[PDB]
Amino acid sequence: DTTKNTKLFTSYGVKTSKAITTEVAAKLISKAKRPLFVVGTGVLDPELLDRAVKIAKAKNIPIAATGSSMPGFVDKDVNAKYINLHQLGFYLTDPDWPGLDGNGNYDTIILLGHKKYYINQVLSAVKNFSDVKSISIDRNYIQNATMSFGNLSKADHIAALDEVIDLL
Template sequence: MVDVIKNTQIHCTYGCKSSKAVQPDVAGKMISKAKRPLFIVGSQILKDEELLKRSIEIAKKADLPVAATGHSMSGLVDQGVNAKYINVHALATYLCDPNWTGLDGKGQYDTIIVLGHFKYYIDQVLSGLKSFSKLKSIAIEREYIQNATMSFGNITPAVHIEALDELIDNL
């Protein structure tokens, strides 16, 4: 088992509540038990072929709808995943709206999973969601994301790939 919860050092915090460090097997089980999850991927998945491969595998294995932000959509086209492009800030606004019916029109999401974003960027987005919605958020990023409900710790790229593999095994 990969230990990804050791290093949760942060340099500043947003509010009084920080995310709980989570192991990959627990995150995988939580994703698979979510009633209405949404996988939000950022353009950083395109910088590493292994990360892109794991992103596609997560979406396929858990049958997750994917919100492709930035230019991440280019890596998801013709990959057999249910991906739709949306701006991450617009998505955050919609996720806070209890009347929004989701990207597919089937209702509000209960859990979001984030991967492939810049830390400073996704932390701000999750800060708003933490304050203005009841969503659970699971950050499976390489960095500890303190505004998520749960997050991996600060880990190396090699450990991150191992952690994603373990998460996939538990979906």
């Protein structure tokens, strides 16, 4: 039940993200054309790092390790690259950005382990000045995303991540 609690302290406006279940998020990630996995330093928690690695490996998703989360991906066998999150949000709005690997922009970004007040400010520009889709699979309900999980506890977040991995 990732769609129950969608409480916010403050609101950006009338528009808000759609609360989704694990099945819907799994379908959206599996049917994505050119997805990107944007992860902040919050992913370095041991219970989140293995889940993120398994999600990325299950679908061969390139990883944008913003902040200082890159050290948690060096040993793993994934395609992860460092980029400043603000610069990544600026570059996603440019249609002719070559991308991290130089093969074109991305149409869907999966967000995990981010500070609410930071990912929300990046997603504001991303959603208002581009056509990229955003799926927040974190434990905080993100308003500025396109699709997002609701407010969850850490145990519930882990269970939801396992559910998403099962259907991936």
